[PDB]
């Protein structure tokens, strides 16, 4: 819930996942996200919706979109001696969707 640069007006802006409903979200550098991004992507990929409770606005928004993501392995080189789950930073709950 941000402020508009020109109209001095509040705006409820959903992320790329709520803005890509009935479309596709293309995510680059998928392995270098902070806590907020991981939580948002987890909710989107679990329930295909995003909740929000900010500044008097309590609502839910639809995020029925497909996700295509790109990433790089730990250390910058894939190690075939280990399972894929140990070559990437992503945990299992996000890697099972």
């Amino acid at each position: 819930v941000r402020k508009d640069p020109i109209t001095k007006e509040w705006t409820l802006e959903g992320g790329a996942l709520v803005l890509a409903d009935k479309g596709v979200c293309l995510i680059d550098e998928f392995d270098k996200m902070n806590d907020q991004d991981r939580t948002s992507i987890h909710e989107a990929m679990e329930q295909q919706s995003i909740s929000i409770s900010k500044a008097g606005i309590v609502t839910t928004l639809q995020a029925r979109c497909s996700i295509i993501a790109a990433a790089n392995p730990n250390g910058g080189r894939y190690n075939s001696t280990l399972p894929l789950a140990q070559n990437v930073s992503l945990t299992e709950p996000i890697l099972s969707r």
Binding site: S53, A55, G56, V58
Partner: protein, 201 residues
């Protein structure tokens, strides 16, 4: 504060909430005295404002006298004038009652004289007073705006502090003769430390 509407203007109401913002107590001028040395005589002027009385009175041209009718110069006698204390506070809907996730509602209250300092911010309060309206929401002006309304506030005449959990105010009861007699009678028994102790939880 949430359920106060335009239907209740100009009525005596009682409102409970949380004190959110107090002000700095200040004096207000109510009578101004003067001395004229040339004639050796004392004069006095009186002043009034909207929030002094409940009824409406034609405004008077407040002007501080500087020269006597005969022309003799005047000097102020600050010690013989009259001043009355004045505070303004803000009350809000308690967190224990306000709906979750929605911005709360507020109302201003005006206190004066002997009700000017009896509560502190963050306390639970109950104010009994008259809900009033003041000014002109652009009505007098030929062209001011079409998106404003009249200003409202409460002329407090009673304030009570309420005791809650995890709150600053401390509970208190009025003890009667019966209560004191019973306490004194009960304190005689030898097992008192056990009676008062097994009764906890």
């Amino acid at each position: 504060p949430r359920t106060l509407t335009a239907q209740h203007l100009n009525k005596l109401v009682s409102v409970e909430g949380i004190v959110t913002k107090t002000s700095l107590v200040r004096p207000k001028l109510i009578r101004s005295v003067h001395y004229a040395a040339k004639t050796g005589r004392f004069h006095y002027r009186d002043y009034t404002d909207a929030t002094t009385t409940l009824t409406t009175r034609i405004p008077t041209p407040a002007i501080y006298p500087t020269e006597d009718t005969e022309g003799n110069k005047l000097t102020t006698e600050y010690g013989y004038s009259t001043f009355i204390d004045h505070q303004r506070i803000t009350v809000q809907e308690m967190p224990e009652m306000a709906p979750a996730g929605q911005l709360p509602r507020s109302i201003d209250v005006i206190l004066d004289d002997d009700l000017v300092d009896k509560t502190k911010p963050g306390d639970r309060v109950n104010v009994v007073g008259v809900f009033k309206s003041l000014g002109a929401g652009g009505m007098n002006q030929s062209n001011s705006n079409t998106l404003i309304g009249f200003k409202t506030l409460i002329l407090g005449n009673t304030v009570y502090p309420l005791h809650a959990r995890s709150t600053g105010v401390a509970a208190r009861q009025m003890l009667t003769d019966f209560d004191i007699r019973n306490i004194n009678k009960l304190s005689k028994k030898k097992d008192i430390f056990d009676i008062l102790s097994q009764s906890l939880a």
